[PDB]
Write an enzyme that holds these catalytic residues in place. Structure first.
Site, PDB file in Angstrom:
ATOM      1  N   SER A 200       0.832  -1.210   0.000  1.00 28.46           N
ATOM      2  CA  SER A 200       0.000   0.000   0.000  1.00 28.46           C
ATOM      3  C   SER A 200       0.870   1.265   0.000  1.00 28.46           C
ATOM      4  CB  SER A 200      -0.949  -0.008   1.204  1.00 28.46           C
ATOM      5  OG  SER A 200      -2.110   0.737   0.902  1.00 28.46           O
ATOM      6  N   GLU A 324      -8.878  -5.642  -4.054  1.00 26.25           N
ATOM      7  CA  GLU A 324      -8.225  -4.446  -3.527  1.00 26.25           C
ATOM      8  C   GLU A 324      -9.182  -3.453  -2.883  1.00 26.25           C
ATOM      9  OE1 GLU A 324      -5.186  -3.761  -3.073  1.00 26.25           O
ATOM     10  OE2 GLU A 324      -4.045  -5.189  -4.304  1.00 26.25           O
ATOM     11  N   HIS A 437      -7.318  -5.892   0.692  1.00 24.27           N
ATOM     12  CA  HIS A 437      -6.088  -5.108   0.732  1.00 24.27           C
ATOM     13  C   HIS A 437      -5.329  -5.391   2.029  1.00 24.27           C
ATOM     14  CE1 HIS A 437      -3.761  -1.632  -0.639  1.00 24.27           C
ATOM     15  NE2 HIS A 437      -3.822  -1.114   0.574  1.00 24.27           N
TER      16      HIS A 437
HETATM   17  C1  LIG Z   1      -9.337   0.283   4.328  1.00 26.41           C
HETATM   18  C2  LIG Z   1      -7.982  -0.399   4.564  1.00 26.41           C
HETATM   19  N1  LIG Z   1      -7.176   0.093   5.666  1.00 26.41           N
HETATM   20  C3  LIG Z   1      -5.751   0.144   5.431  1.00 26.41           C
HETATM   21  C4  LIG Z   1      -5.069  -0.158   6.718  1.00 26.41           C
HETATM   22  C5  LIG Z   1      -6.124  -0.768   7.561  1.00 26.41           C
HETATM   23  C6  LIG Z   1      -7.387  -0.135   7.085  1.00 26.41           C
HETATM   24  C7  LIG Z   1      -7.721   1.084   7.949  1.00 26.41           C
HETATM   25  N2  LIG Z   1      -8.532   2.249   7.561  1.00 26.41           N
HETATM   26  C8  LIG Z   1      -8.399   3.032   6.354  1.00 26.41           C
HETATM   27  O1  LIG Z   1      -7.566   2.767   5.530  1.00 26.41           O
HETATM   28  C9  LIG Z   1      -9.279   4.237   6.134  1.00 26.41           C
HETATM   29  C10 LIG Z   1      -9.593   4.681   4.839  1.00 26.41           C
HETATM   30  C11 LIG Z   1     -10.396   5.828   4.633  1.00 26.41           C
HETATM   31  N3  LIG Z   1     -10.606   6.096   3.237  1.00 26.41           N
HETATM   32  O2  LIG Z   1     -10.423   7.278   2.686  1.00 26.41           O
HETATM   33  O3  LIG Z   1     -10.932   5.130   2.532  1.00 26.41           O
HETATM   34  C12 LIG Z   1     -10.921   6.585   5.780  1.00 26.41           C
HETATM   35  N4  LIG Z   1     -11.804   7.828   5.780  1.00 26.41           N
HETATM   36  C13 LIG Z   1     -12.437   8.223   7.071  1.00 26.41           C
HETATM   37  C14 LIG Z   1     -12.067   8.687   4.627  1.00 26.41           C
HETATM   38  C15 LIG Z   1     -10.592   6.128   7.051  1.00 26.41           C
HETATM   39  C16 LIG Z   1      -9.768   4.967   7.243  1.00 26.41           C
HETATM   40  O4  LIG Z   1      -9.454   4.528   8.507  1.00 26.41           O
HETATM   41  C17 LIG Z   1      -9.857   5.251   9.618  1.00 26.41           C
END
Ligand SMILES: CCN1CCC[C@H]1CNC(=O)c1cc([N+](=O)[O-])c(N(C)C)cc1OC
Ligand SMILES: CCN1CCC[C@H]1CNC(=O)c1cc([N+](=O)[O-])c(N(C)C)cc1OC
Ligand SMILES: *[C@@H]1O[C@H](CO)[C@@H](O)[C@H](O)[C@H]1NC(C)=O
Ligand SMILES: *[C@@H]1O[C@H](CO)[C@@H](O)[C@H](O)[C@H]1NC(C)=O
Ligand SMILES: *[C@@H]1O[C@H](CO)[C@@H](O)[C@H](O)[C@H]1NC(C)=O
EC number: 3.1.1.7
Lengths: 533, 535
Positions: A200, A324, A437
């Site tokens: 990532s 993904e 992912h």
């Molecule tokens: C979605 C995959 N992930 C990557 C690592 C573990 C997990 C954690 N959380 C995210 O990657 C994640 C993403 C977004 N986003 O923009 O998609 C987001 N927003 C509030 C906009 C918040 C997030 O976590 C708090």
């Protein structure tokens, strides 16, 4: 005292700890400082080399995690908490970890350097899924991983300013890379064979070291798992970065120098509290403070740099997982939850697209919807759900990866590509999310070799295969086992044949065309359409 | 009268006719050929709506085909059967409004369902007298009463100065409507049933059938409709009033000519002079575009076909629609560089890009880009075999397959009973090269049962195939259902619906049911492309 656990580096002596791996002991040196703590007036500033220390430095435990946002979407749920900080938060966080075999390698050993992901806003080298003991014990690798600053602390930028020039978190990584050059031989590591790997945002970082000349003398090969420096989320323009920074300042009650001075008086959590509030649109797979096109670390946009670059002496392994996008949907798209099957309506799908592709004009969003709709089943909720995932995965990862692979191959690079299709038997996320992912990492690192983790025995054999591909790639630039005399081998990705392999419980299968048709839509058509809408 | 065949003498509203006993393979049929149905649209009547034929005295001989309406004669491959078979086979004349009737011999005892054929030819050519439209087989084998009419084509049928009295437009369509009215009044004299009239036609003939569906005064003149490889909607079958006017006036200028005065001058021009310039008024280098076609006049067509199919109530309608496997291939040799009947026509990427501009002549640069991007195989973006086939698919999808899909969907969603097919058999007798596959127009000879004629050298299977197809078409005409009610064992042909999108493959093998008429690609043409245009 065990002389195997005693190392002298340029900064002084340190003491590591002997750890148990299922097949034998490894030496671990955890919490090694590679920079002066970037605190107080050093907040937002480039890192500086760690000053020498007296006596023997205790390197037997992980150090603090860089100050970051902590996920609360599903409190106490294993699937989210496994990415959350597992040590205390601190801006004093610039430390790296080294695993070598026990006893220390007799001859110079290839080095793998792991760069964690986490959207450039989170992550740590101390997470269980990044445990280097297995690669160390089984493959005899020297493995390194560093903490680097994330969020505002690592990427808040007022481009042009002396006191927040941007990209300092990438500089933290680079400093760690420099530390490896100067010190790794003391551990039995070979500084002339250094392979970066990351997932990532970590993969994107690796990509940026490829595209930034001062980094190029610090490694020889690269692995990018589910991430690229090109694409919609990994970078921002100077103008957008400057915009997000002054908005953040405004949000916390704060001339660049004055603005940054006031930001520096703020407690770390006050910055984190408003981190998410600076994004220009409602979105997912979008992060507030990321690398900035400064004309310095990045002399131009990643897209421009991959287009014109000469990558003749480069070997890269790049790939994606099967699903993904699925993970990101529960973080912003209405209708999606880990607690049900997330069957969505057509209206919800169109709404989801504006969020998953937040930079899209109406017409562009319409193009996306019409491309991804199954016109045999235009209102089928199962397909609408899976299409929503595909839109997000393709836009943010698969197609950027296909674009990168293509440019690198066409411009001299040796490229190997994969798709990872095995879903862990131990996965805590629902079935509908498929292979999400991040869930190839535990296999690459060899966690299934720990019997206490209850992975199946086929999964253990699988993990051993992946460790061999990765380490063989590290050793040679070619993931193929030189003892395996069987067809099929893993062929290089090229622009003509576009070959890549599936990584799963079955033997390697060779495929051609990494979402060729759909990625032509993203990589060739959509830019034309946006630059006209 | 008294020494001739008493079974060949018939009276219609205009007077007495003497037909001819023709030999079909399984027995004799009755033919009444060259029946006049309008006053000759010549001289001051050029460009004008047809007037009903005034009664004649005595017995009109109806034993030979009459004149073919004045038209462009294809010279692309002189002497080659593949082209000549579509060319006029009688003298060209503006005096050409005649129709033909085939019936069983002797004529039917009870009122018999009527089939009315409307030929294609891009609205600039065609004739009811062509061999491929021979009604003898349908009449003999299925007992059909078959009618086909000549109608004016080209400038003579479609040159329009919208709003004017002297060239209102669509007069070729009024020729057709007048023939339909003639059938209503007179077909009973031949044993035909005026209360069961099914229209069928191919290409522009199909578009014509669709326009009769969409034009209120034609609606009372037929009951069911078959549209083969053509639709009233789509990029070629109609032009706006402004575009018709623009083409009319340009043409006038090219031949040396207030609407009254302009048209008066056009009426002094030799027919051939008009024909010699008709291709010169097209706005872009193109294929599958025709200069003088039906115009959206706010009269015959109260609005665009697209608007009419979208908001129409078609509960009373039963339609059979379909396409051939390679709709576009035939057209590539009439204007896309790299294409020829005499070689494999493998083309380069450059020739593909240029072909797309010609094949989608109204496309902006961005739209053309979208087309190239969608049709390119990104695993083999420069393979000449794939590029050649893609060029064909671009033209066929844009002009026929996707307009048909659009029509079937709107009609189905709005109450119509729809049956859909794809025709996939290439005649063993085809003279066009293999690369063209099953080209536009090459199902017609099977529907009309030509392979029943042993002198034509079709295989035994093709003969059995033709019989199956005649059955479907005549069953549909009879009942509004192509299925044989006394078979059941044979696979059934389900209606096309929005929910299931079913259609059948027509070939040597038994019916196979498929779903989605190029659903994915046609979403590009039918849903996305127009939005890209309005931008
Ligand atoms: C979605 C995959 N992930 C990557 C690592 C573990 C997990 C954690 N959380 C995210 O990657 C994640 C993403 C977004 N986003 O923009 O998609 C987001 N927003 C509030 C906009 C918040 C997030 O976590 C708090
Ligand atoms: C190509 C299919 N047809 C239909 C019946 C047999 C054959 C006859 N010829 C055509 O339909 C035909 C078409 C086009 N066109 O627009 O692609 C054309 N020009 C562009 C000049 C000329 C044509 O004939 C001379
Ligand atoms: C799943 O749950 C979420 C919140 O708990 C809700 O928004 C969504 O409507 C649910 N979906 C289904 C499949 O019922
Ligand atoms: C086929 O024939 C045409 C006309 O003679 C020509 O323009 C075209 O280039 C030819 N293609 C090949 C592969 O010979
Ligand atoms: C059919 O076959 C015969 C015998 O070869 C041949 O002489 C004749 O010309 C053919 N007829 C047609 C229509 O091609």
């Amino acid at each position: 005292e065990d002389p195997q656990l005693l190392v002298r580096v340029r900064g002084g002596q340190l003491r590591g700890i002997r750890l148990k791996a299922p097949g034998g002991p490894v030496s671990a040196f955890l919490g090694i400082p590679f920079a002066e703590p970037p605190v107080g007036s050093r907040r937002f500033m480039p890192p500086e080399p760690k000053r020498p220390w007296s006596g023997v430095l205790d390197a037997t435990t992980f150090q603090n995690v860089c100050y970051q946002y902590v996920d609360t979407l599903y409190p106490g749920f294993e699937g989210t908490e496994m990415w959350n900080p597992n040590r205390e938060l601190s801006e004093d966080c610039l430390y790296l970890n080294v695993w070598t075999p026990y006893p220390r390698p007799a001859s110079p050993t290839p080095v793998l350097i792991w760069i964690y992901g986490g959207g450039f806003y989170s992550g740590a080298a101390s997470l269980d899924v990044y445990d280097g003991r297995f690669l160390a014990q089984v493959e005899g690798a020297v493995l390194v991983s560093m903490n680097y600053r994330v969020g505002t602390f690592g990427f808040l930028a007022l481009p042009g300013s002396r006191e927040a020039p941007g990209n300092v978190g990438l500089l933290d990584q680079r400093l760690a890379l420099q530390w490896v050059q100067e010190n790794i031989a003391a551990f039995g590591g070979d500084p002339m064979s250094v392979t970066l790997f990351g997932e990532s945002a970590g993969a994107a970082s690796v990509g940026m070291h490829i595209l930034s000349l001062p980094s190029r003398s610090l490694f020889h090969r690269a692995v990018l798992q589910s991430g690229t420096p090109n694409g919609p989320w990994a970078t921002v323009s100077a103008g957008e970065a400057r915009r997000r920074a002054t908005l953040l300042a405004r949000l916390v009650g704060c001339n660049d120098t004055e603005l940054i001075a006031c930001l520096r008086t703020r407690p770390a959590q006050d910055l984190v509290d408003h981190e998410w509030h600076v994004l220009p649109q409602e979105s997912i797979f979008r992060f507030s403070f990321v690398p900035v096109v400064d004309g310095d670390f990045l002399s131009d946009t990643p897209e421009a740099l991959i287009n014109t670059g000469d990558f003749q002496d480069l070997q890269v392994l790049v790939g994606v997982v099967k699903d993904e996008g699925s993970y990101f949907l529960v973080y912003g798209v209405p209708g999606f939850s880990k607690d049900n099957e997330s069957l969505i309506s057509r209206a919800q799908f169109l709404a989801g697209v504006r969020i998953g592709v937040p930079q899209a004009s109406d017409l562009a969003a319409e193009a996306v919807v019409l491309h991804y709709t199954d016109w045999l089943h235009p209102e089928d909720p199962t397909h609408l759900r899976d299409a929503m995932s595909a839109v997000v995965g393709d836009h943010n990862v698969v197609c950027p990866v296909a674009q990168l692979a293509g440019r690198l191959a066409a411009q001299g690079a040796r490229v190997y590509a994969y798709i990872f299709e095995h879903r862990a038997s131990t996965l805590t996320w629902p079935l509908w999310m498929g292979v999400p992912h991040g869930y190839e990492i535990e296999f690459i690192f060899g966690l299934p070799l720990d019997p206490s983790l209850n992975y199946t025995t086929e999964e253990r054999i699988f993990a051993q295969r992946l460790m061999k591909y990765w380490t063989n790639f590290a050793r040679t630039g070619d993931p193929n086992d030189p003892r395996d005399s069987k067809s099929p081998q893993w062929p290089p990705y090229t622009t003509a044949a576009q070959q890549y392999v599936s990584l799963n419980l079955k033997p390697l299968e060779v495929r051609r065309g990494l979402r060729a048709q759909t990625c032509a839509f993203w990589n060739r058509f959509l830019p034309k359409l946006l630059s006209a809408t």
